[PDB]
Write an enzyme that holds these catalytic residues in place. Sequence first.
Site, PDB file in Angstrom:
ATOM      1  CG  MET A   1     -48.652  62.628  23.210  1.00 29.86           C
ATOM      2  SD  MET A   1     -49.486  61.189  22.473  1.00 29.86           S
ATOM      3  CE  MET A   1     -50.708  61.971  21.846  1.00 29.86           C
TER       4      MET A   1
ATOM      5  CG  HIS B   1     -52.712  63.115  24.112  1.00 30.47           C
ATOM      6  ND1 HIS B   1     -52.120  64.021  24.966  1.00 30.47           N
ATOM      7  CD2 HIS B   1     -53.109  63.822  23.027  1.00 30.47           C
ATOM      8  CE1 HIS B   1     -52.156  65.226  24.419  1.00 30.47           C
ATOM      9  NE2 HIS B   1     -52.751  65.131  23.243  1.00 30.47           N
TER      10      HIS B   1
ATOM     11  CB  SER C   1     -38.687  50.152   2.576  1.00 34.23           C
ATOM     12  OG  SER C   1     -37.430  49.601   2.228  1.00 34.23           O
TER      13      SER C   1
ATOM     14  CG  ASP D   1     -37.880  49.245  -5.098  1.00 34.19           C
ATOM     15  OD1 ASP D   1     -36.708  49.561  -4.797  1.00 34.19           O
ATOM     16  OD2 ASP D   1     -38.825  49.299  -4.286  1.00 34.19           O
TER      17      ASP D   1
ATOM     18  CG  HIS E   1     -37.739  52.050  -2.638  1.00 37.15           C
ATOM     19  ND1 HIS E   1     -38.336  50.888  -2.197  1.00 37.15           N
ATOM     20  CD2 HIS E   1     -37.187  52.626  -1.543  1.00 37.15           C
ATOM     21  CE1 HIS E   1     -38.149  50.765  -0.896  1.00 37.15           C
ATOM     22  NE2 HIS E   1     -37.452  51.806  -0.473  1.00 37.15           N
TER      23      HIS E   1
END
Lengths: 290, 290, 290, 290
Positions: free
Chosen positions: D1, D140, D156, D232, D267
């Site tokens: 990383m 890390h 979503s 939405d 949304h």
Amino acid sequence: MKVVKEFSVCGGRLIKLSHNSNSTKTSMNVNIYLPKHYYAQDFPRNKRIPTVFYLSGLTCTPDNASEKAFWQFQADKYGFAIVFPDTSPRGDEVANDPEGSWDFGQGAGFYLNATQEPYAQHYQMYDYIHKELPQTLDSHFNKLDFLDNVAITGHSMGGYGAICGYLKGYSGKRYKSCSAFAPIVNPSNVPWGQKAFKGYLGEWEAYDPCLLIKNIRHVGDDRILIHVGDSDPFLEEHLKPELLLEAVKATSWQDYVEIKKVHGFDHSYYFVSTFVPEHAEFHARNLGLI
Amino acid sequence: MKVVKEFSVCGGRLIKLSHNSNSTKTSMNVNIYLPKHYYAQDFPRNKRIPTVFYLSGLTCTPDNASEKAFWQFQADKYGFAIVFPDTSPRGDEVANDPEGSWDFGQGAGFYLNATQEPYAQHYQMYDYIHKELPQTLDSHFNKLDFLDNVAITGHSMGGYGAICGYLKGYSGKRYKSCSAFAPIVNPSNVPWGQKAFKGYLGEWEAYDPCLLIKNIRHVGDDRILIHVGDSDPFLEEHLKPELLLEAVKATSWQDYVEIKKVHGFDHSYYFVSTFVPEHAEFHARNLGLI
Amino acid sequence: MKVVKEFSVCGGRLIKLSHNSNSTKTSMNVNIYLPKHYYAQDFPRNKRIPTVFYLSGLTCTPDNASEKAFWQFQADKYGFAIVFPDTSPRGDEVANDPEGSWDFGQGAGFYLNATQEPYAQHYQMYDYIHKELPQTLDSHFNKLDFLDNVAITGHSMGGYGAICGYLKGYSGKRYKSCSAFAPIVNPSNVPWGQKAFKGYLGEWEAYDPCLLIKNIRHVGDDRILIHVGDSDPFLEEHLKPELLLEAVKATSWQDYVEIKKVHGFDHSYYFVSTFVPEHAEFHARNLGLI
Amino acid sequence: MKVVKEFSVCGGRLIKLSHNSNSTKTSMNVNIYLPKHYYAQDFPRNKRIPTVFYLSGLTCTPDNASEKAFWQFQADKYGFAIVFPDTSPRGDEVANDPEGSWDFGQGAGFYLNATQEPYAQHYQMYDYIHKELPQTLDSHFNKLDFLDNVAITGHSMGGYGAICGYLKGYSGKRYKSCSAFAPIVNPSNVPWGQKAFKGYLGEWEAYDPCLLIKNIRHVGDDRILIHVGDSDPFLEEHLKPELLLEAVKATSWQDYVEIKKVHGFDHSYYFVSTFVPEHAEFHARNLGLI
């Protein structure tokens, strides 16, 4: 060199390759069209299919002219190979224009050896085209001649790079032929030229045709062919051929640089593809194909 | 019709035009090349200057083939004008694919007349190509003939839309010649057509060359010329020419539909441009220019 | 003025609008947040709700700041409406930088009324923000006060814009309070400033905070709040805030202009959104909300 | 990383990381926000700074939620670190949707372990988020806990992942709390979900919350918090929350899934950012921060 993609076109094929450049310090893209004479059948004659190097203009990638200039047809017609190199280093670690302009960063190396440190690390485009790429290609293929009798041509900035490499290697006959389409002929007094000069170089003599052509003795019947449309939007401000005509006046190159204007033409490849045929014929006769 | 831009190309000119389509309701862009024969000096019975209609495939604009297939050279060689229409309704207020696919929607009209409510609103590309556009052009230029002796050609989706509008209007001799580059010969049985048939039409009989040819009466020596490369990425699943060779087997049309595979070629315009000269000659003969 | 879209945010609404501007001769886009206080229910004194005008930086559209500054929350916390205008005239009809820089042209009007003939036609951004839009908003909505006691702010090009408008209209109390985030304060003697000046105006005393403030008699305990991260990539080259400080010295404005250094911060909206709450209270006090 | 970017936000820092994933055989990008609580003092307990994982939706990058949700303010208020993983494999050697749709492949991994060959090579997103990423993050940085005291949430397609992963790791107490912003809770029976399943999987069962919840013994006070504006645009055909309420009836989970409708909300992240303060409180509580 590694083959990225090969497309069959006309009687031969277009090959898109890449290689790590040692002058660019980056991976560079190059397209080349091998005529039908390659893949032929005879040839005890040997390694001698001439090569035309076509340098593109601002913004371009090797694909623009490969796709809209239609040189393939003429390559098959007269018997030559044609190389389309890129216009600059390109990449995330490559310097670029500080304002996001398209007339100076990547896609606009102006075929110069940049000395200014932001750029000097990659912008060695003069070397890349006249020294490295030719040897890199010959070493990848060798039937082909990329170093002896080669012709150089270009469009706009690419046209400028053509007339430039030809004139700087004249006393050694570096290029056997030279033509340009809508060339930037005198970059010390044109917006894009002055910009690239200031950015890549300090503060010019070398690199500017109108100045370089007064220190060069003409030989035999060698000429420079130039076409430029009168409806070209950048004519008045960026491409002032007339200048290279007054720099040739009362010089040994007088009457050895014809600038056919031609009515109604653009700066687009509708203009380039139109006269490509004539240029193909001009180079063929200088390369010895007719 | 309006003139957006006028470029000089070869011996004639390319013209960028926009007009308001009643068939689409939306504004539309079209491109056309007037031969070197136009602009000349005289010519009498010349009004019969035929016109070739070139339809493009998915995602294309009239500009693609205008710039990449070099028809203009062929146009001047035989004396025919060539029209490059768009591929769909196009606009902000026009419907598009619900998943954002380049397959369906704008740039993917598939040359059908939309029935399904959303698309029906503007997707009347069939009536646009074979009805409004020809007449709109003849009223803007009339000399030129966009109505009587004209040929139709296309690439991929356009190739399908070429072989289709030729067969449909065959009884009335709507088109004198017909060719296509790597066409979608049997939309039913193929994903792209299958989607466009379900999205624009319901649930197909018509609009399908492999179906429409079993029942049409073939005349004389008439034939359909087709080229497709065997390295075409879409060959095996989106355009199977062979399905025409079978649908034509045992028909008045058998033996009069030729497909030329040709080794190594793409679906790209490197392929299209390589065979444009042959095709142009094909239409030259049928249009009486030679 | 027309309603393009509405999004309920926090306890109020974000309204994206468009209208035909007379200072721009082009349809312009503007975003506005109406707080919970609008929609609330009572209290006769309606006009009371003050307004903050947030001017954006190079390249921005009204959506940037609306989406990343989090102003809505502070708006609801104190009861003010915040308006986000665009950064310049927009369209193909509208001129742009000749080299493609994000640096100047569209997305870069610099809140100036241009005089140089190519852009003078659309770039009357000074008038658009301080004269036209206010009246325009007031006419569409009227409850809301867009002309009397209002505050002005901005980021970078927008901070410059905010400070310039506050200073020029100071003697007339055009704005009740002003602050900026990493603003450009000395347009002259700074690359982006100089280029906008040369390009929009001739050859600039007016329009420059560091030259104007020397001739503006300071009043009461009025002050300008300024934040800026010490890790801003543009600090030393493009935005030297110390200049405003150096200017204010030996001026009645001394001690009334504080620039908070704030270690580790960027030029991004991660920086802006962090100091928005402190700026929102600064304005609240000066607008009489707390 | 390794660290790409690192800037100050609120009292802490946002960190953009990259790392070579084994689940994706690709390099993946990840954003993380360390609260002011990091960068402070001693603390014997210390290793208790909990972490919240926010999965994003279709076409998103870690930057969308990092720039538009404002979680940073909540993280400093309660004291948690928040991780924003990416939504798919990303790359040219990585498969994408064959028709170029945006609701499948790249930007649309659906947090599933793909078995179908094209995608199966890089789409191991389930393992990526629930096992590789946390161990890699834990490795890390180690004060921080990314494996034990963790909360998961999403938006979503992200909300669906949050909910699904929460239930699947319930027997092991994989996550201490779970909530979602407009989640797709019944992937089967909904378009984007069905396409996701058919493409990445064969035949689904083991990845549908509506099917998963019916077989898990509810414990203590455990509940799932959901918000989803009634405005939405995808509510009625893609995200049908009501369906998870029906699957919860006559189940031990009934009364523990609260769907707060919320009137007039989109949304968009104006919706998400508005209720982020409420969701932070929920998780903070469940993580023993208050």
